[PDB]
UniProtKB/TrEMBL annotation, chain B:
It comes from the Eukaryota. The modification N6,N6,N6-trimethyllysine is found at residue 6. Belongs to the histone H3 family. It comes from Homo sapiens (Human). This is H3L-like histone. It is found in: Chromosome.
Amino acid sequence: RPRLWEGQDVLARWTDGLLYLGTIKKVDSAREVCLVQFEDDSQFLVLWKDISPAALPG
Amino acid sequence: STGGVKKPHR
């Protein structure tokens, strides 16, 4: 039932309006964000709204 | 990855 989970590869929309590939580290249901780790090892909170799975629709 | 660089997807 959860759409997002720890260890999931995702695309996250950043403050420049572009998508970046990352991996979910933590899911925060209270604030509806995930801590996402990016390719440069940076980690930021991203709104659920701005996150989608990288995996093929199937 | 340390020293890695972010690029916009696709």
